[PDB]
Ligand binder design. Structure first.
Ligand SMILES: Cc1cc2nc3c(=O)[nH]c(=O)nc-3n(C[C@H](O)[C@H](O)[C@H](O)COP(=O)(O)O)c2cc1C
Ligand code: SF4
Ligand code: SF4
Ligand code: SF4
Ligand code: FES
Ligand code: FES
Ligand SMILES: [K+]
Lengths: 430, 87, 264, 214, 41, 51
């Protein structure tokens, strides 16, 4: 199929996204969950990993790495140490709400995916590191986990199989950087949320020094339905190498900001006009869009006209598909102030380990504040571009890249706006 | 942490008396061979130069640092004591 | 070649053991990679980012202090990408570093100054205001001017692993992250002037050796130590016929790199 | 705002009375059992959170008590408490209003919410009301961005709020009854505000679309 | 049935709900591996 | 790294102060080599053989 979108409700993988249909275990069994899971576990780890590889599911964390290959990193025999699955329920990126929605409205999908992924890797426990601000979501997840333990779906007989698994929930304490892979591992281990270098990879040294695999909530939540319904089906959705369904959050200046499940490779304009009710004032009033959450740069209306919603499509459009969090800005907004607020966010949420990210993102925050006021000079635009290029690729984790990229997008597209602000400031202060 | 000031063999003399000037409090000296750092590319060259000029010498061997096993993954050990508590 | 792997640096073809880092291979050939947080007797931190080097046919620079060489790598230590990385990291350090060099104590002993002159740029693009951090009262031996700390955690790693007191650490996040004790703590152990040694900047200086001399002034005499039967090797830094400072020497079989507080 | 240096005030000395309730001791035992037999220092974060939930804020005696219980260095406990932002190292109000001011929320006008809260409570930026039950602070993204004009009071999210909506929420809090958490002004959780456009039909039950051979 | 919100049991959660649920869950879990040490010291 | 910066830049900049300090304490490192430079001085050919 050349065109994508208009996903069928019977093909929606995240039924009960809107809080109906009794999120507890009885409603999960009515909607279809924990079905043939014993058959899946007895079918075994190699079959599950081959199912993931044939489905072609990619990380849904924003990373974009092939889930099947990443999970098949740990198909080794035993070492002496246990193995762990870790789920990232931190969801700290601006624009992103999908993990919160699925944890509070269909948590048994997350629990079943923890069990299936833990069996696929070969493991004894899944630590769900949830965000600290999601107290009600964490309590609902604990209610679901207690119901699964009472039903015998976890612990000493995984759904009647001879596999032993445990599911723990550990809450954060308010750090966006703890959504990172190794920083989350450190936060579980009880230190500060500072990411560690790679190598060693988490598949060799993770939490407590054990082989671990860190996976997104949406990834593990679509995992057991991928195993159950094939994977050729999941690859049938979406384009080549960008396959399946995706939870798009749409926020900002849209008529109905909402979280909706939609097929991959759907047009941005089609997605907004079909699910968000359109831009406030119209598609002509649309100025810019951030398609990923906050780590991805801007795309203006001109390229937003025809862009698709793939990793490859946004890479071609000099952006990325991160958490699929379409932030929409119409013409009646301060785009420089929005980008400066994003740099404020990255300055406040930097963990402070690397000198590049630490000092450079503080520097970016000050330069962007002066850009918003107008008291800069047009040479400082290229100076800020070089500061961004110095930050990017020179840090331990990708928060430095995710702070450099919105600056690069703003400089790339809305440079006459910055120059206009500077000349207006200069002529009004002289 | 720089090591460029090593790797050249220095010949120096024994330190003599540096007393205090009665007028100004400066450091007065009586021997001319006080600041006599001589640079040589090899220990045998320094030995030959000292023997040729007729000075008694004490030569001490080069103290290279020992090659050490370094692994970043030891900071997060599962059972060993090398696990750190702070990054 | 039993358990020996061939790695190239600038085309040279040195054999190293597995698990050898890029920095260790480069120093085995003879090149000293710039560093601020790596210390050969401390655990690898990898946070100062000064040791970023380019591997051939690899788009991303790697940290030489932590990355182990795999096989057939060609380490391009003097490439344009590596020089740009070093300039960027040095610029980021000196952006918020305070211009305290004359009133400082690392006059000719500053790794930050020397590596700036050798690998950083010659100018600053920083047009903003620098941060400032309130000082601590860590003891009568170590004077802490923590405004000029570069957050390299070397003192933290030393006091956790070698001294083993676990009293130093990082409090805060981002540019506000500070090194020290959260409480008013009197960090007084033996082997506690070695943080003055290993601190590359003048954040941790010697309080008795407050403002008395400069390294270019000091004549260095390599001697041994008494009042301890270990017999650790020291350097007496004198000036104008007066003993000014006692530094440690390097003897791997007696005292390694450091000495005790009594002999210091 | 808050300084990462303890000044040792009379109200926050390392002798202020802190100890866990016996049921909190049982909860700490459950947490330590959740972590493996080695690496019990991984329980620093939730035990410190439990101390905060018991005591309101987190004094230095509470931090030292958590360190003593878990046999962890107090400096490591201070590292955790200073690093993470949800730990209150100063006494806060009873309700602790947190207004998200990141980019999609300020696109949907969280500044009006913040200024109406400011003029409603009489506090400027980040201080406490005199009756010691409200502390208004700005925060970053709280994860509810499709419900962009939102706020967090203690553990509850109040979303899609007009200025009069946040005023009447504050009136309800001053009256004493806790207001209903969640998004107000029509939406249940996150659906579009024009009716359902996504699911709109009963979900298929078990066995639907099951591949053969499984 | 499908026209009403039904997550309303998150309304009546107290400050100790998560930890009480964890304490209730502590009896359902398998014995955990040891590192061979009381602590990393 | 060869010429000292201006005094205002030295008192307002970090790299400038570092370079001022190092040029006025150690001086610039000249790369190794030997040259003979001859200049038509008024008395005659004035030469410097620098190693
Ligand atoms: C600063 C930063 C924040 C991140 N926050 C999140 C987050 O909130 N949730 C998430 O799932 N991944 C987050 N990630 C990306 C993780 O690296 C990634 O999700 C993780 O490797 C899981 O892989 P997956 O996407 O294949 O499941 C973050 C990364 C960075 C650098
Ligand atoms: S890039 Fe920033 S947030 Fe990431 S590890 Fe470095 S200092 Fe921490
Ligand atoms: S530590 Fe070095 S760069 Fe910093 S003020 Fe002192 S001499 Fe200058
Ligand atoms: S005080 Fe010195 S040794 Fe310690 S982190 Fe700062 S710069 Fe490094
Ligand atoms: S020496 Fe490698 S990052 Fe500091
Ligand atoms: S940006 Fe405000 S809740 Fe996410
Ligand atoms: K020092």
């Amino acid at each position: 199929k050349t065109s994508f979108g208009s996903l069928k409700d019977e093909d929606r993988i995240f039924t009960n996204l809107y809080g109906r249909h009794d999120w507890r275990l009885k409603g999960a069994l009515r909607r279809g969950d924990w079905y043939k899971t014993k058959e899946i576990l007895l079918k075994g780890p190699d079959w599950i990993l081959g199912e993931m590889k044939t489905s072609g599911l990619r990380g849904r964390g924003g990373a974009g790495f092939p889930t099947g290959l990443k999970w098949s990193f740990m198909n080794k025999p035993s070492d002496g140490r246990p193995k762990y699955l870790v789920v990232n329920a931190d969801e700290g990126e601006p624009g992103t709400c999908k993990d919160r929605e699925i944890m509070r409205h269909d948590p048994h999908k997350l629990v079943e995916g923890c069990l299936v992924g833990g069996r696929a890797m070969g493991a004894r426990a899944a630590y769900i590191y949830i965000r600290g601000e999601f107290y009600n979501e964490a309590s609902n997840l604990q209610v679901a986990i207690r119901e699964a333990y009472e039903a015998g779906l976890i612990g000493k007989n995984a759904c009647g199989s001879d596999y032993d698994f445990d599911v723990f929930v550990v809450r954060g304490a308010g750090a966006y950087i703890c959504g990172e892979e190794t920083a989350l591992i450190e936060s579980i281990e009880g230190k500060q949320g500072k990411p560690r270098l790679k190598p060693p990879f988490p598949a060799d040294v993770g939490v407590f020094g054990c082989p671990t695999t860190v996976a997104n909530v949406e990834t593990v939540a679509v995992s057991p339905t991928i195993c159950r319904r094939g994977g050729t089906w999941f690859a049938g959705f979406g384009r080549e190498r960008n396959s399946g369904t995706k939870l798009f959050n749409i926020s900002g200046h849209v008529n109905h900001p909402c979280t909706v499940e939609e097929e991959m490779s759907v047009p941005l304009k089609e997605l907004i006009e079909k699910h968000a009710g359109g831009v406030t004032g119209g598609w002509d009033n649309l100025l810019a869009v951030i398609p990923g959450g906050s780590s991805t740069p801007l795309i203006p209306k001109s390229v937003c006209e025809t862009v698709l919603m793939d990793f490859d499509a946004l890479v071609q459009a000099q952006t990325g598909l991160g958490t699929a969090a379409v932030i929409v800005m119409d013409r009646s907004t301060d785009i420089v102030k929005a980008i400066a607020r994003l740099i404020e966010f990255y300055k406040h949420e930097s963990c402070g380990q690397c000198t590049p990210c630490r000092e450079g993102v503080d520097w970016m925050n000050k330069v962007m504040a002066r850009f918003v006021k107008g008291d800069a000079r047009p040479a400082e635009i290229d100076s800020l571009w070089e500061i961004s290029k110095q930050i990017e690729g020179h840090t331990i984790c990708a928060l430095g890249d995710g702070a450099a990229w919105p600056v690069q997008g703003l400089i790339r597209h809305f440079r006459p706006e910055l120059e206009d602000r500077m000349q207006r400031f200069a002529q009004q202060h002289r | 942490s720089g090591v460029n000031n090593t790797k050249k063999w220095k010949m120096e003399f024994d330190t003599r008396e540096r007393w205090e000037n009665p007028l100004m409090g400066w450091a007065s000296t009586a021997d001319p061979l006080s600041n006599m750092v001589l640079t040589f590319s090899a220990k045998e060259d320094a030995i030959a130069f000292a023997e040729k000029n007729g000075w008694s010498y004490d030569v001490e061997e080069k103290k290279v640092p020992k090659p050490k096993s370094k692994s970043y993954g030891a900071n997060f050990s599962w059972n060993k004591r090398t696990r750190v508590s702070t990054k | 070649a039993s358990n020996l792997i061939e790695v190239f640096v600038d085309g040279q073809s040195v054999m190293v053991e597995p698990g050898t880092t890029v920095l260790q291979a480069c120093e085995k050939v003879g090149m000293q990679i710039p560093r601020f947080c790596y210390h050969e007797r401390l655990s690898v931190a990898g946070n100062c980012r000064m040791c970023l080097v380019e591997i051939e046919k690899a788009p991303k620079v790697v940290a030489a202090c932590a990355m182990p060489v795999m096989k057939g790598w060609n380490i391009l230590t003097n490439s344009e990408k590596s020089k740009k990385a070093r300039e960027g990291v040095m610029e980021f350090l000196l952006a918020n570093h305070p211009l305290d060099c004359p009133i400082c104590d690392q006059g000719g002993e500053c790794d930050l100054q020397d590596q700036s002159m050798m690998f950083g740029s010659d100018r600053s693009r920083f047009l903003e205001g620098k941060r400032a951090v309130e000082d601590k009262n860590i003891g009568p031996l170590v004077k802490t001017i923590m405004t000029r700390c570069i957050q390299c955690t070397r003192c933290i790693r030393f006091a956790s692993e070698i001294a083993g007191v676990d009293d130093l650490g990082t409090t805060g996040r981002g540019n506000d992250m500070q090194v020290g004790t959260y409480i008013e703590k009197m960090f007084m152990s033996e082997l506690s002037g070695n943080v003055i040694d290993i601190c590359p900047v003048g954040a941790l200086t010697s309080k008795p050796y407050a403002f008395t001399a400069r390294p270019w002034e000091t004549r260095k005499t390599e001697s041994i130590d008494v009042m301890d039967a270990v017999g650790s090797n020291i350097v007496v830094s004198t000036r104008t016929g007066e003993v000014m400072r006692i530094l440690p020497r390097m003897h791997e079989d007696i005292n390694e790199e450091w000495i005790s507080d009594k002999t210091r | 705002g808050a300084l990462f240096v303890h000044r040792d005030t009379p109200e926050n000395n390392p002798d202020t009375p802190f100890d866990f309730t016996p049921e909190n001791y049982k909860r700490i035992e459950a947490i330590v059992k959740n972590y493996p037999e080695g690496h019990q220092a991984a329980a620093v974060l939730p035990v410190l959170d439990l101390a905060q939930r018991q005591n309101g804020w987190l004094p230095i005696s509470a931090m030292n008590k958590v360190a003593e219980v878990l046999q962890v260095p107090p400096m490591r406990v201070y590292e955790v408490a200073t690093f993470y932002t949800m730990y209150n190292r100063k006494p806060v109000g009873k309700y602790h209003i947190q207004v998200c001011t990141t980019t999609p929320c300020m696109l949907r006008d969280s500044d009006s919410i913040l200024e109406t809260l400011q003029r409603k409570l009489g506090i400027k930026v980040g201080e406490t009301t005199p009756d010691k039950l409200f502390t208004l602070i700005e925060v970053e993204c709280l994860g509810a961005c499709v419900n962009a004009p939102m706020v967090q009071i203690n553990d509850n999210y109040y979303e899609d709020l007009t200025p009069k909506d946040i005023e009447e929420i504050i009136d309800e809090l001053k009256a004493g009854k806790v207001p209903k958490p969640g998004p107000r002004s029509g939406r249940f959780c996150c659906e579009p505000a024009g009716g359902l456009t996504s699911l709109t039909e009963p979900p298929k039950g078990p066995g639907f679309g099951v591949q053969a051979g499984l | 049935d499908t026209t009403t919100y039904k997550n309303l049991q998150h309304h009546d959660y107290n400050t100790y709900t998560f930890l009480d649920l964890n304490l209730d869950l502590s009896k359902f879990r398998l014995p955990q591996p040891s590192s061979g040490r009381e602590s990393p010291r | 790294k060869v010429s000292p910066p201006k005094r205002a830049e030295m008192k307002t900049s970090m790299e400038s102060l570092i370079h001022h300090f190092k040029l006025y304490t150690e001086g610039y490192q000249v790369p190794p080599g030997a040259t003979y430079t001859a200049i038509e001085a008024p008395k005659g050919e004035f030469g410097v053989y620098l190693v």
